[PDB]
Write an enzyme that holds these catalytic residues in place. Structure first.
Site, short mmCIF file in Angstrom:
data_model
loop_
_atom_site.label_atom_id
_atom_site.label_comp_id
_atom_site.label_asym_id
_atom_site.label_seq_id
_atom_site.Cartn_x
_atom_site.Cartn_y
_atom_site.Cartn_z
N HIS A 144 52.14 17.03 69.77
CA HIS A 144 52.30 18.23 68.95
C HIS A 144 52.07 19.46 69.79
CE1 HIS A 144 51.30 15.81 65.11
NE2 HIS A 144 52.55 15.66 65.51
N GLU A 165 52.23 9.98 63.82
CA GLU A 165 51.99 10.52 62.48
C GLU A 165 53.29 10.51 61.66
OE1 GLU A 165 49.55 14.21 63.05
OE2 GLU A 165 48.10 12.72 62.40
N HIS A 183 48.41 18.78 71.76
CA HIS A 183 47.56 17.62 71.69
C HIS A 183 48.42 16.43 71.29
CE1 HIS A 183 47.85 19.22 67.65
NE2 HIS A 183 47.88 17.94 67.32
N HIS A 208 48.38 12.40 69.09
CA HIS A 208 47.78 11.41 68.20
C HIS A 208 48.27 10.06 68.71
CE1 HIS A 208 46.95 14.55 65.11
NE2 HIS A 208 47.99 15.09 65.71
N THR A 260 48.22 18.40 60.01
CA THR A 260 47.94 17.00 59.71
C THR A 260 46.46 16.63 59.82
OG1 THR A 260 48.24 16.14 61.92
CG2 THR A 260 50.23 16.32 60.56
N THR A 261 45.60 17.58 60.14
CA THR A 261 44.17 17.40 60.05
C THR A 261 43.64 18.52 59.19
OG1 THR A 261 43.47 18.84 61.92
CG2 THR A 261 44.11 16.60 62.46
N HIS A 281 38.20 14.72 67.81
CA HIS A 281 39.36 14.19 67.09
C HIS A 281 40.56 13.89 68.00
CE1 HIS A 281 37.06 15.61 63.60
NE2 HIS A 281 37.09 16.84 64.08
N1 RA1 Z 1 48.11 18.02 63.99
S1 RA1 Z 1 48.73 19.48 63.81
O1 RA1 Z 1 49.27 19.56 62.48
O2 RA1 Z 1 49.62 19.84 64.90
C1 RA1 Z 1 47.43 20.57 63.89
C2 RA1 Z 1 46.22 20.37 63.15
C3 RA1 Z 1 45.17 21.26 63.23
C4 RA1 Z 1 45.26 22.38 64.10
N2 RA1 Z 1 44.10 23.15 64.13
C5 RA1 Z 1 43.81 24.18 64.93
O3 RA1 Z 1 44.62 24.57 65.78
C6 RA1 Z 1 42.53 24.89 64.69
C7 RA1 Z 1 41.66 24.93 65.79
C8 RA1 Z 1 40.45 25.58 65.68
C9 RA1 Z 1 40.15 26.21 64.45
N3 RA1 Z 1 38.85 26.90 64.36
O4 RA1 Z 1 38.76 27.95 63.78
O5 RA1 Z 1 37.88 26.38 64.87
C10 RA1 Z 1 41.01 26.20 63.34
C11 RA1 Z 1 42.23 25.51 63.44
CL1 RA1 Z 1 43.23 25.56 62.02
C12 RA1 Z 1 46.44 22.59 64.83
C13 RA1 Z 1 47.49 21.71 64.70
ZN ZN Z 2 48.68 17.06 65.65
#
Ligand code: RA1
Ligand code: ZN
Length: 257
Positions: free
Chosen positions: A116, A103, A91, A93, A195-196, A61
């Site tokens: 992010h 986003e 990471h 996007h 956001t995922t 992703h």
């Molecule tokens: N795009 S965002 O809102 O910053 C964001 C979206 C998703 C995540 N997810 C994670 O950090 C994550 C990674 C691994 C795992 N797992 O158990 O494999 C679970 C999550 Cl929630 C972190 C940040």
């Molecule tokens: Zn993100």
């Protein structure tokens, strides 16, 4: 499973993850004229001097770089936050073209990419427990525009050749995420979600007003990554962004007038 395509993309996520239609989903459009300046907001404190980066990971992703978060290093506090939040990973996007990729949007403007920096609330002991809490995470979002190169980004760009495909990782030590921060720490903040998937409503969003500039060449290298695994048909890692979601009841606060 979920991804960014026509048949599994953001418009489909609600079937496996019904919270996708919840009351605090992210990202949102930041209407800068309805955001409220809050002079009570304590300044943001980003203390990354001891951040120990460990590794960079391509996950199907995006590319996640994860930090050693076992000690009190690389902390976000102040601003809207109560307590201390510790950096675990960052990471991005980004888009297939410079005209989209972010986003969050700012008065409907889309940036070329969005960074992010993901932090977990130290009162919950680790990331996995924190994501199950309403105030578990603080994500610092930074927009990228295409212009001058960001020198502090180049070490990331150069490693991407080794993680082209899903599941590849490389050692990545001594990287100073301070090299990815704009001058100003002026920000907007609002309550939202990942956001995922799993789209958990655990995030205090802190979105910086000032974008960083990266070169066209830098973002072009992001676009050479692949969503697919090694030995599967090639699908370029582009347009890995969720569009703006309904604001619903929420208020966006500004740290500046
Ligand atoms: N795009 S965002 O809102 O910053 C964001 C979206 C998703 C995540 N997810 C994670 O950090 C994550 C990674 C691994 C795992 N797992 O158990 O494999 C679970 C999550 Cl929630 C972190 C940040
Ligand atoms: Zn993100």
């Amino acid at each position: 499973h979920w991804g960014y395509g026509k048949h599994n993309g953001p418009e489909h996520w609600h079937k496996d993850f019904p919270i996708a239609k919840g009351e605090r989903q992210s990202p949102v459009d930041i209407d800068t004229h309805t955001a409220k300046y809050d002079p009570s907001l304590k300044p943001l404190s980003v203390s990354y001097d001891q951040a120990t980066s460990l590794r960079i990971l391509n996950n199907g992703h995006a590319f996640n770089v994860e930090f050693d978060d076992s000690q009190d290093k690389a902390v976000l506090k102040g601003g809207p936050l109560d307590g201390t939040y510790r950096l675990i990973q960052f990471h991005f996007h980004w888009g297939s073209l410079d005209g989209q990729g972010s986003e969050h949007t700012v008065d409907k403007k889309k940036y070329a990419a969005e960074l992010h920096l993901v932090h977990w609330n130290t009162k919950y002991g680790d990331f996995g427990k924190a994501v199950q809490q309403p105030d578990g995470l603080a994500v610092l979002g930074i927009f990228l525009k295409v212009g001058s190169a960001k020198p502090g980004l180049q070490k990331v760009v150069d490693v991407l050749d080794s993680i082209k495909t899903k599941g590849k990782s490389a050692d990545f030590t001594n990287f100073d995420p301070r090299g990815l921060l704009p001058e100003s720490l002026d920000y907007w903040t609002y309550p939202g979600s990942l956001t995922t998937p799993p789209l958990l409503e655990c995030v205090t969003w802190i979105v910086l007003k000032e974008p960083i500039s990266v070169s066209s060449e830098q973002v072009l290298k992001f676009r050479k990554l692949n969503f697919n695994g090694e030995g599967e048909p090639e699908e370029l890692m582009v347009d890995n962004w969720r569009p703006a979601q309904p604001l619903k009841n929420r208020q966006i606060k500004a740290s500046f007038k």
